[PDB]
Amino acid sequence: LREELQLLQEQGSYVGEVVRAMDKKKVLVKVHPEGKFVVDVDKNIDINDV
Amino acid sequence: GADREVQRILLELLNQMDGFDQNVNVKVIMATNRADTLDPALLRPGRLDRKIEFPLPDRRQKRLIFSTIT
Amino acid sequence: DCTFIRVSGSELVQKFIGEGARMVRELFVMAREHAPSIIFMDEIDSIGSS
Amino acid sequence: XXXXXXXXXXXXXXXXXXXXXXXXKXXX
Amino acid sequence: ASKLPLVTPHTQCRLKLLKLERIKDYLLMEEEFIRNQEQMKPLEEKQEEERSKVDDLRGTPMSVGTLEEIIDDNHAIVSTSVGSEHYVSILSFVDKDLLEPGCSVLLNHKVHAVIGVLMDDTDPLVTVMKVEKAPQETYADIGGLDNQIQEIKESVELPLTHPEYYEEMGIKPPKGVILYGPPGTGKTLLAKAVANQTSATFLRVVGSELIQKYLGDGPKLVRELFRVAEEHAPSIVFIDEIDAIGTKRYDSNSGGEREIQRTMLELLNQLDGFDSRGDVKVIMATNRIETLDPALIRPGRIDRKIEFPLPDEKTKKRIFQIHTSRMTLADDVTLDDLIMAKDDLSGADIKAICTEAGLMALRERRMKVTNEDFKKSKENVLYKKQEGTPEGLYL
Numbered sequence: 198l199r200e201e202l203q204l205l206q207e208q209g210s211y212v213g214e215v216v217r218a219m220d221k222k223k224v225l226v227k228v229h230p231e232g233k234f235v236v237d238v239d240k241n242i243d244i245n246d247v
Numbered sequence: 248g249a250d251r252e253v254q255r256i257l258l259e260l261l262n263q264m265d266g267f268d269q270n271v272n273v274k275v276i277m278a279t280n281r282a283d284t285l286d287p288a289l290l291r292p293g294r295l296d297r298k299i300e301f302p303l304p305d306r307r308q309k310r311l312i313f314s315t316i317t
Numbered sequence: 318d319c320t321f322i323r324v325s326g327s328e329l330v331q332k333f334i335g336e337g338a339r340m341v342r343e344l345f346v347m348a349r350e351h352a353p354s355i356i357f358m359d360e361i362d363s364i365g366s367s
Numbered sequence: 368x369x370x371x372x373x374x375x376x377x378x379x380x381x382x383x384x385x386x387x388x389x390x391x392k393x394x395x
Numbered sequence: 396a397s398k399l400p401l402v403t404p405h406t407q408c409r410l411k412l413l414k415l416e417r418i419k420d421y422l423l424m425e426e427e428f429i430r431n432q433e434q435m436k437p438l439e440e441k442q443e444e445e446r447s448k449v450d451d452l453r454g455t456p457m458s459v460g461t462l463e464e465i466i467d468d469n470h471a472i473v474s475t476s477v478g479s480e481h482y483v484s485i486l487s488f489v490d491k492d493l494l495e496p497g498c499s500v501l502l503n504h505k506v507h508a509v510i511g512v513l514m515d516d517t518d519p520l521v522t523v524m525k526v527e528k529a530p531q532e533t534y535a536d537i538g539g540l541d542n543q544i545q546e547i548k549e550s551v552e553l554p555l556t557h558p559e560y561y562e563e564m565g566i567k568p569p570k571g572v573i574l575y576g577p578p579g580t581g582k583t584l585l586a587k588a589v590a591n592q593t594s595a596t597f598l599r600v601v602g603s604e605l606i607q608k609y610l611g612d613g614p615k616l617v618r619e620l621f622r623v624a625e626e627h628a629p630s631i632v633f634i635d636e637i638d639a640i641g642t643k644r645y646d647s648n649s650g651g652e653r654e655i656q657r658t659m660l661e662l663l664n665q666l667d668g669f670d671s672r673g674d675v676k677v678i679m680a681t682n683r684i685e686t687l688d689p690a691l692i693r694p695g696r697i698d699r700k701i702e703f704p705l706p707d708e709k710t711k712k713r714i715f716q717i718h719t720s721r722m723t724l725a726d727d728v729t730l731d732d733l734i735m736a737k738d739d740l741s742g743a744d745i746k747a748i749c750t751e752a753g754l755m756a757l758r759e760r761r762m763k764v765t766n767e768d769f770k771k772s773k774e775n776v777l778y779k780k781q782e783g784t785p786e787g788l789y790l
């Protein structure tokens with residue numbers, strides 16, 4: 198609880214929907230309002246899980 | 248560009264028309280003059296069941312309306 | 318003595334764009350999975366499209 | 368059968384945000 | 396890729412034997428030069444070094460825009476997802492050749508420069524109108540035409556399959572073919588049979604479905620039809636049933652019929668007015684031929700007109716055989732009981748008989764085939780014709 202005050206003075210995270218992935222560890226995501234983005238995946242996740 | 252936005256409200260209307268709980272006391276009353284140019288998805292068992300018309304008066308009801316106003 | 322399947326599917330599914338390309342797919346998976354089955358339909362496409 | 372139509376507009380919404388660590392004086 | 400554009404002998408002349416073996420020499424030697432690169436300095440210079448220079452050059456989040464216009468060579472105008480438009484320069488990393496307006500791109504953050512292109516999807520209009528695969532039976536289905544088969548083959552197939560004779564005399568093939576005759580003859584069959592055995596794309600269009608309750612959409616569907624047919628492939632455009640949609644200017648009225656006049660007027664120009672469309676095969680099918688607009692009938696648009704008669708006792712013996720080729724046949728039946736007798740009934744009537752005998756047998760839950768199946772089926776198909784006939788006695 199004492200540590201907690203700094204951790205919520207920290208930026209949030211977006212949520213989007215994967216249309217479909219393509220080669221070289223990238224996907225294609227419309228977020229909520231805006232266009233579609235070709236972005237990077239994490240190192241903890243896999244391409245096959247998408 | 249428009250009737251998409253119009254009909255998706257009707258879908259939003261019908262979705263939250265169906266699933267209250269059949270226990271929460273919410274009464275919904277709607278009224279028009281023209282009961283003809285309607286979607287029969289409103290005219291389903293579960294959403295809108297009671298259908299009440301307000302017709303023109305007759306000789307007895309003309310006497311009753313004349314009595315109250317005068 | 319066949320597995321009856323009633324599909325109402327009137328217009329609330331006609332609006333659904335992103336899953337509109339799969340609602341027939343897994344439904345026909347469901348027909349060939351459960352039993353000798355019989356799928357029933359109605360006016361719903363003719364009100365939607367001709 | 369041979370009938371024209373007009374149209375309409377559905378304008379999108381707009382929103383903006385910043386880091387908000389900028390002071391607006393510089394005067395005086 | 397576009398290695399040498401010359402084809403001009405176009406025969407067994409010794410010139411092509413010399414030129415193509417020069418091309419054999421310049422390609423072997425280019426290979427044998429470059430084979431001695433991975434032999435003596437077999438270095439991997441640009442596996443990731445080309446990539447990591449550029450993946451670090453572009454941003455890690457990519458954003459999809461939309462082309463609007465293209466200006467001189469590097470800077471073009473784009474559109475963001477909301478409508479904010481940016482006059483940004485493209486790089487020499489994207490294929491400039493598949494960069495036409497109305498396409499998605501990839502952008503940057505700071506300078507918003509065009510970095511890459513996203514590939515397109517398949518248009519729905521091909522999936523609507525194109526008979527996608529080889530649909531149905533081949534020339535084992537048809538009953539003895541052998542002259543009508545010969546005309547459509549040398550008008551479409553032999554021009555397409557073996558083009559060598561037209562370019563000897565320099566004479567272009569004829570363009571348009573009309574299929575006409577009494578209904579129930581096999582006009583839809585002959586289109587689908589050529590659609591079965593083909594090498595180019597085939598397009599089927601029902602002509603009655605070209606009348607919209609809006610307006611302007613008549614010519615709009617036409618001008619997109621040949622646009623798709625030209626841009627896609629070598630193409631064969633078949634439009635069934637043009638007789639009740641494009642007949643003539645019969646009264647020059649208004650209110651819909653004037654719109655139908657405008658749709659055929661666009662189709663007439665979209666068929667042939669300007670900049671000859673090239674590798675576009677047009678095949679049209681009618682029942683009636685007389686009440687057609689002669690501006691379509693003139694050459695330059697349609698050059699082949701093929702009558703479809705009705706054989707009497709000769710090709711029917713296979714049409715009765717082919718429609719009974721996949722079914723049972725008990726020994727009590729003779730097809731000559733019906734072939735020899737009446738001489739006018741259509742091949743569609745023969746199919747109507749050969750299905751009804753299968754209907755009459757299994758309705759009564761019986762075994763294979765009786766003669767009285769073919770008796771009652773022929774009697775029924777008479778009333779299938781006659782009950783819609785107002786004819787009295789000699790008119």
Ligand SMILES: Nc1ncnc2c1ncn2[C@@H]1O[C@H](COP(=O)(O)OP(=O)(O)O)[C@@H](O)[C@H]1O
Pocket residue numbers: 536537538539577578579580581582583584714717741742743744746
């Ligand atoms: N020569 C034939 N061989 C086999 N079947 C035939 C023949 N002629 C007609 N038919 C039958 O009749 C039908 C003919 O279709 P078609 O005459 O093209 O209809 P329409 O002319 O009204 O478009 C086909 O379904 C086919 O089964």
